[PDB]
């Protein structure tokens, strides 16, 4: 037989890893996604809002529009430490779960608007990060996904596009 001792290090590194470079992609500037009437906006530790406006696709830069529709999903922490990360994977490949709730909860339902992250390797290896997809699949919980190039120098996430 053989030990598998190295996978747990292996897992160690690319999550913590994976952290750092998240934060580091996103402190340079936030991300947001517009999911057709609305958009959804995504800082580096700061909150999650989805907001009715408009984008400029040049660069991804938002309109000027009015600020009576906007909401909450999630408040993050604003240090790394003070959070808390999850290495996992799915039949595709590893991945970086990240769950941020204290929203407002939805009285129609009776639970939390938190928001759902999953941080993986981004098709294009030379590019900053951005949301890929946006989809309120309950009526309070909502997933998205978040693509890096960074994440896939990590062999664990050396798996995309599949």
């Known amino acids: 037989g053989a030990s598998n001792s190295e996978k747990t290090a292996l897992l160690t590194k690319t999550l913590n890893q994976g952290v750092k470079t998240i934060f580091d992609k996103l ?3 936030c ?6 009437f609305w958009i959804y906006e995504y800082c580096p530790g700061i909150e999650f809002v989805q907001f009715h406006g408009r984008v400029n696709t040049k660069t991804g830069e938002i309109v000027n ?3 009576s529709l906007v ?5 993050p922490k604003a240090n790394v430490e003070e959070r808390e ?3 996992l994977y799915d039949d595709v490949g590893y991945y970086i779960s990240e769950i941020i709730g204290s929203g407002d909860i939805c009285d129609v339902t009776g ?3 938190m928001v759902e992250i999953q941080y993986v390797c981004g098709g294009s290896n030379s590019g900053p990060s951005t949301i890929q997809w946006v989809r309120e699949t309950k009526i309070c919980v909502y997933e998205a996904q978040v693509t890096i ?7 664990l996430l050396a798996k995309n596009e599949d």
């Open 27 to 29: 402190n340079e500037r």
């Open 31 to 36: 991300i947001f996604y517009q999911a057709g």
């Open 65 to 67: 529009r009015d600020e």
């Open 71 to 75: 909401y909450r999903l999630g408040k």
């Open 85 to 87: 990360f999850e290495l």
């Open 111 to 113: 639970a939390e608007r």
């Open 149 to 155: 190039p960074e994440l896939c120098n990590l062999e």
